[PDB]
């Protein structure tokens, strides 16, 4: 991360499709370098379809400029998450903040 930023880092990192952002708030059921399973909360759940949010991360694949894009989980097992919370850090990201 930058030590000196402008506060515009979080918006730029969240509003691009590199991080993995929690669709629905819940509790982290399971974490792995490749997968995140989130147990949704009762208040935020549909009548049927108990369901759980599964985010498959994007490991070492190739970008247009031959660089490397790679998603790293930043949450840990058994942790709360609200909506709009970054779960995985894309390339040049650090706990949601943009880090170039």
């Amino acid at each position: 991360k930058p030590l000196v930023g402008t506060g515009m880092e979080r918006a730029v990192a969240v509003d691009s499709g590199v991080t993995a952002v929690a669709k629905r708030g819940g509790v982290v059921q399971y974490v792995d370098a490749s997968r995140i399973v989130i147990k949704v909360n009762e208040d935020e759940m549909y009548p049927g379809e108990a369901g759980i949010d599964i985010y498959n991360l994007t490991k070492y694949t190739r970008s247009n400029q031959n660089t490397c894009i790679n998603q790293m989980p930043c949450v840990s097992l058994g942790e709360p998450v609200e909506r709009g919370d970054v779960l995985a850090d894309g390339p040049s990201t650090d706990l949601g903040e943009l880090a170039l």
Binding site: P2, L3, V4, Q65, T67, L100
Partner: protein, 50 residues
Amino acid sequence: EIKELLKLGDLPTSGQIRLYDGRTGEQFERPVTVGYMYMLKLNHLVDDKM
């Protein structure tokens, strides 16, 4: 505000500290500006240009 935040820590408010030569052990005169700067590595690599 920068000077106040420097004074919160135990750093000098001038921003410039005293340095020593790495290979002669001799104090440079003229306190120099040291600090932390955010460096980028641009995608112009010399092993792609040679």
